[PDB]
């Protein structure tokens, strides 16, 4: 499995070294595929900070430049292992990943859904987890839209104007993870 174990981050995984999930000390794990082995980046917190910002799709870390849109780093492919999405576990699970959904506005910036849309990040993330190929109808002001997950775009159904939609996690630094473990 490609999922980071929540029990290992919290009170402890009873499956010890036989767990089917990844055991890492952070809720995220950035890796680069070299040959046939995924290899940990050194400065994961910096990569994560760049990734979580919706207006940042480039991250120069070390010698290599990372492109989040393509999820590659100097040609070589990369990946971000994560803990389960927060909407799939109770609220007590503090180490789950909280995903924010943004749409890019006319002025060029990213706006969180709900900040006015009748859907929010919890709504969209839940729908996406239960169906990743769905289309979500929603309303904002007097306008109506369809949000396509598989295309990750919102479309006004009247004008057919399209706008980009992005899904990114909230950032947590390692020291705050330590605090959470206390
Ligand atoms: Zn485990």
Describe this structure in words.
This protein is an alpha+beta fold. The chain has a domain at 99-169: Signal recognition particle alu RNA binding heterodimer, srp9/1, CATH 3.30.720.50. The protein has 4 helices and 12 strands. A hairpin with a 2-residue loop joins strand 1 and strand 2. The chain starts with 5 loop residues before the first helix and ends with a helix. The relative contact order is 0.15.
Descriptive key words:
restriction factor, globular, antiviral protein, monomer, monomeric, alpha+beta, Signal recognition particle alu RNA binding heterodimer, srp9/1, binds zinc ion, Zinc finger CCCH-type antiviral protein 1
State which percent range the strand residues make up.
25-35%
CATH topology of the domain at 99-169: Signal recognition particle alu RNA binding heterodimer, srp9/1
Ligands bound, unique: zinc ion
Put simply, the count of helices is: 4
- Summarize the helix and strand pattern as letters: HEEHEEEEEEHEEEEH
């Amino acid at each position: 499995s490609e999922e980071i174990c929540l029990d290992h981050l919290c009170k402890g995984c009873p499956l010890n070294g036989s767990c089917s999930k990844v055991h890492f000390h952070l809720p995220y794990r950035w890796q680069m595929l070299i040959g046939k082995t995924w290899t940990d980046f050194e400065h994961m917190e910096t990569i994560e900070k760049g990734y979580c910002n919706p207006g940042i799709h480039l991250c120069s870390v070390g010698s290599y430049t990372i492109n989040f849109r393509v999820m590659s780093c100097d040609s070589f492919p990369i990946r971000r292992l994560s803990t389960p999405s927060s909407v799939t576990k109770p609220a007590n699970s503090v180490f789950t990943t909280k995903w924010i959904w943004y749409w890019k506005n006319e002025s060029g910036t990213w706006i969180q859904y709900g900040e006015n849309s009748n859907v929010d990040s919890s709504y969209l993330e839940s729908l996406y987890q239960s169906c990743p190929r769905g289309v979500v109808p929603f309303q904002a002001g007097s306008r109506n839209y369809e949000l396509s997950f598989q295309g990750m775009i919102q479309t006004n159904i009247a004008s057919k104007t399209q706008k980009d939609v992005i899904r990114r996690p909230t950032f947590v630094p390692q020291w705050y993870v330590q605090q959470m473990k206390r």
